């Protein structure tokens, strides 16, 4: 069952049941009120992408350099979520992974559909790789997201492919494509913070047509070739629909000889990492994020 | 585990690694070996199709009528089976359900791709529901198949919606659309005698391009209502990689308000329906799908 903690919070988002203004407001003030760990400096950036100019939130942390650089997209269903709800969250990974963090304000639906996310996840990804030198970063670049997030990180470890050289890819409990018959979509489709119909909503004002299902770009796990990809970490938890296919995804990397650890968090709800300060699990969950990053940049303990 | 018995078996069809007529041939030679139980009556027929003259076979039991009608819609892929490797399990349904059975000749990939199946499959049930006289069959029309032909049964069920009525629907360990992240379809994606291998074969040929996955006539589960269907039968076997999503399908017929049982059949695999004589649990099913159709034609234990 779920951690007692759990149960007595969603016993006491109104998404698709509100405006969109809404929404991302309640959002905004249930993931900012978490506590803002000190790191050592926070610097706000403009990155030139392809189609529009991306604000980024760059952390440092309180060790020396060099550093690695960990490019971190946000979920939020593709509608909500911002830069700064993720805060508390991006300072508490800086502070485990001993790493620079580069949080990216991707473009978001309605206002931008489908592929806008992807397409500035991407561009951020490759200035930052093209520009390490600008936060001591040459100990390499990484890539992380959760939930949607996970998703737009996936899908750039994928396009990354014989463009630029990611050291790792974190998925936390990511959403990798379209999934009408898996077990977790079906059982914790309701009661379990990320519902079904949110779901349906959030497909609803991203994608443009049914085609987009079947790109790769929004579901990853077809990709005709998962070989060569960098290493992950991937991240479900027990009661969250996208359990499942979190599950398949890592499953079908180490079938294509990918590396990948995949852990699955008992006892808590899609979001866990995000509600850090109440669900010890959370930090847990980012101390072990901490480990991979901390190993694979500078090969520390 | 798998039952020692199954497990004897798969260690003592080549999908994808012969012609397409050697694997039509091997299959012919593995199902047509069962027992064929007498019937009262074996009858070939043609129906009149809308782009075909449609054999099926018609099997009457030794009961005296009158009689419902089952339509049975073989399952291999949309490639393999006919209604003649058939045979001894309609033979068997016939003297469960004390009822007619009409085992149809649907068009077969890849000569004819989708929807050519569904075409048929719809055409013909359509034609045996307006001729029912011709069969003493007056207690009604059921729909039923396996694997592909369960797809193909539930799809129909989906079209006849406001132009027959049905009086049930029994999809056994039926596809019910496209699938890429279910726990059993990639666990037992290897060594349960259907493969993903196989499956994905099996769609190459089937299907003219990725389009056709989003269509409700392929995948019946993302159809935008599923209110008002037949009552459903529906089995799964543990060890399937379609298992996840005909539990999937029979939980959202349920939420749609259609009643639905639905049974798995542990410790088998896919098709073990066809190996009846082998596998003492296919006898059980079939006797199962006898009781809930004795039930709905006859109102008889
Ligand atoms: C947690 C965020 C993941 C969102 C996954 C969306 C799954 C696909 O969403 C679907 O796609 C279609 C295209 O708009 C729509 O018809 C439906 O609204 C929706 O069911
Ligand atoms: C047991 C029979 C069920 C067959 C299910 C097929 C699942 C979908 O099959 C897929 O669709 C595409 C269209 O041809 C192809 O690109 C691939 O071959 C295949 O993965």
Redesign the interface.
Same mark, same amino acid.
């Given at each position: 069952p779920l951690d007692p903690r759990i149960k007595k919070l969603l016993e006491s988002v109104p998404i698709g049941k509100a405006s969109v203004d809404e929404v991302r407001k309640i959002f905004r003030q249930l993931a900012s009120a978490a506590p803002k760990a000190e790191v050592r400096k926070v610097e706000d950036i403009k990155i030139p992408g392809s189609e529009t100019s991306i604000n980024a939130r760059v952390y440092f942390p309180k060790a020396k350099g060099p550093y690695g650089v960990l490019v971190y997209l946000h979920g939020g269903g593709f509608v909500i979520g911002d830069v700064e709800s993720y805060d508390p969250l991006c300072r508490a990974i800086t502070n485990a992974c001993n790493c620079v963090v580069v949080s990216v304000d991707y473009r978001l639906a309605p206002e931008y559909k489908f592929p806008s996310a992807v397409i500035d996840s991407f561009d951020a990804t490759n200035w930052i790789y093209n520009n390490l030198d600008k936060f001591d970063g040459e100990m390499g670049i990484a890539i992380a997201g959760d939930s949607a997030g996970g998703n737009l990180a996936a899908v750039v470890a994928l396009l990354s492919k014989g463009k630029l050289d990611l050291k790792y890819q974190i998925l936390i409990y990511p959403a990798?494509?379209? #999934?009408?018959? &898996? %077990?977790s979509? @079906?059982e914790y489709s309701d009661g379990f913070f990320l519902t079904r119909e949110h779901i349906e909503w959030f497909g609803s004002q991203y994608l443009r047509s049914? *085609?987009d $299902? $079947?790109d790769f770009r929004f &579901?990853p @796990? @077809?990709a005709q070739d998962l070989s060569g990809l960098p290493p992950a970490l991937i991240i479900t938890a027990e009661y969250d629909p996208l359990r #499942?296919?979190g599950? *398949?995804?890592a499953? %079908?990397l180490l079938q294509a000889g990918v590396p990948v650890t995949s852990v699955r968090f008992n006892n808590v709800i899609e979001g866990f990492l995000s509600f850090f300060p109440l669900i010890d699990q959370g930090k847990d969950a980012i101390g072990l994020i901490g480990s991979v990053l901390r190993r694979t940049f500078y090969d520390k303990s």
């Open positions: 990798v494509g379209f #999934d009408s018959v &898996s %077990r979509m @079906i049914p *085609a $299902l $079947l &579901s @796990i @077809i #499942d296919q599950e *398949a995804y499953n %079908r």
